[PDB]
């Protein structure tokens, strides 16, 4: 499975094609695309490749929902081609089944790479309301890739499996109730997030309490 000898990426395409709806004064529907992102995530190291997708790519094109899956597959292949072979993933796990065929067709030059689907709940969409990603995506004027470390300094003291489990609880809790999750994640008036970190600096005891509360929020 995960946390072995091989490089694994999760790929989430959920947030690539995003639109806002508006009812005009004339009573018609406008559907305006807004910038999206592909999340490509290494659960062992915490590395996130955030590929920001600028609305220009949609041009005057149709069925943008299906096309978006192909755009995602194109970008994953482009990233793989830009990496030395030793940094290429051995397995790619797609969070949505619609990515299986587009990725299969785009990765035919990489017979070493195993593609599979998943039933895991890994809502990277929660990141769109984490200010550090949200504004970056909103304000982009062209496509670009940005690297992050989603585990902050956790791996100094906990294993990759432990870090992944904490991250998933954070994302799922933010997804199900953003406002309440943010309160849970700020236990003290003194609680801060370092400028180069994504998540707060909490004591070991604070994390125990937070992990239980996040889980309960998800169960609710
Ligand atoms: Cl799908
Ligand atoms: Cl890019
Ligand atoms: Mg390395």
């Amino acid at each position: 499975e995960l946390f072995s000898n091989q490089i694994i990426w999760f790929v989430d395409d959920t947030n690539v094609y995003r639109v806002t709806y508006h009812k005009t004064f004339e009573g018609n529907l406008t559907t305006k695309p807004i910038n999206g992102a592909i999340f490509i995530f290494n659960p062992r190291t915490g590395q996130l490749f955030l590929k920001i997708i600028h609305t220009s790519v949609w041009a005057g094109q149709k069925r943008l929902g299906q096309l978006a899956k192909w755009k995602t597959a194109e970008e994953v292949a482009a990233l793989i081609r830009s990496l030395p072979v030793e940094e290429q993933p051995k397995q790619i796990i797609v969070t949505r089944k619609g990515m299986l065929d587009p990725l299969e067709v785009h990765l035919l030059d990489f017979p070493n790479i195993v593609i599979k689907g998943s039933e895991l709940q890994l809502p990277f969409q929660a990141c769109l309301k984490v200010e550090k990603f949200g504004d970056l995506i909103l304000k982009a004027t062209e496509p670009q890739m940005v690297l992050f470390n989603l585990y902050d300094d956790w791996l100094k003291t906990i294993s990759s499996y432990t870090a992944f489990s904490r991250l998933i609880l954070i994302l799922r809790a933010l997804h199900v109730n953003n406002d309440r999750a943010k309160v849970i994640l700020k236990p003290d008036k003194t609680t801060i997030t370092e400028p180069h970190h994504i998540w707060p600096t909490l004591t070991d005891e604070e994390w125990i309490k937070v992990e239980v509360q996040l889980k309960d929020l998800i169960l609710a």
Side-chain angles (χ1 to χ4, degrees):
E1 189 95 339
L2 313 173
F3 315 121
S4 290
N5 66 116
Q6 47 200 240
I7 298 167
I8 300 183
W9 290 348
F10 285 100
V11 169
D12 186 0
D13 74 311
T14 303
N15 311 289
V16 170
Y17 178 62
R18 295 174 70 207
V19 293
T20 60
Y21 296 103
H22 183 251
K23 189 183 292 179
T24 69
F25 292 142
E26 299 76 28
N28 306 126
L29 182 77
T30 63
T31 304
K32 181 176 56 66
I34 62 172
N35 293 339
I38 311 167
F39 291 77
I40 303 169
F41 177 63
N42 183 327
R44 191 175 65 80
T45 63
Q47 177 162 64
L48 172 69
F49 305 86
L50 183 80
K51 277 195 158 198
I52 298 173
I53 305 297
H54 177 83
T55 53
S56 56
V57 77
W58 310 129
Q61 270 271 14
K62 205 168 201 187
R63 293 290 311 276
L64 295 163
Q66 174 73 57
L67 184 57
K69 302 180 197 308
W70 286 99
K71 173 58 173 187
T72 299
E74 175 192 335
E75 292 303 328
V76 170
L79 174 59
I80 289 170
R81 287 182 174 104
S82 75
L83 290 172
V85 170
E86 90 163 49
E87 283 297 311
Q88 298 172 353
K90 169 65 202 177
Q91 189 177 23
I92 298 174
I93 304 168
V94 297
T95 62
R96 301 209 298 173
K97 293 301 207 148
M99 284 301 311
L100 292 166
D101 291 340
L103 202 62
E104 170 57 29
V105 173
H106 269 279
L107 292 184
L108 296 169
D109 300 329
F110 302 92
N112 192 53
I113 303 176
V114 173
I115 306 162
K116 72 170 309 179
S118 177
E119 312 298 317
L120 293 183
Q121 303 305 289
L122 311 173
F124 288 97
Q125 63 172 288
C127 290
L128 305 176
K129 308 160 283 171
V130 175
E131 293 207 1
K132 172 174 296 211
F133 304 112
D135 283 344
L136 173 67
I137 295 162
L138 177 66
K139 298 169 165 191
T141 61
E142 61 193 27
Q144 59 208 261
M145 191 175 74
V146 188
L147 301 181
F148 298 89
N149 163 17
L150 296 190
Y151 295 158
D152 293 343
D153 63 359
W154 307 340
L155 296 182
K156 297 178 182 303
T157 58
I158 65 178
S159 73
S160 291
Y161 148 77
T162 306
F164 183 60
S165 297
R166 180 180 290 172
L167 176 66
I168 297 163
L169 296 180
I170 289 172
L171 297 177
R172 291 188 72 181
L174 287 164
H175 182 57
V176 299
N177 188 341
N178 180 71
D179 289 346
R180 179 59 184 160
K182 278 177 162 169
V183 174
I184 292 169
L185 284 164
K186 193 183 165 193
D188 201 271
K189 57 173 177 301
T190 65
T191 298
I192 63 154
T193 299
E194 288 295 322
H196 59 282
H197 282 355
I198 297 146
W199 312 115
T201 297
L202 303 182
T203 67
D204 292 348
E205 296 297 300
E206 279 170 337
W207 276 119
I208 302 167
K209 168 158 168 244
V210 160
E211 289 157 353
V212 175
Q213 291 180 99
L214 297 176
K215 178 267 293 181
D216 287 337
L217 188 60
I218 297 154
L219 286 177

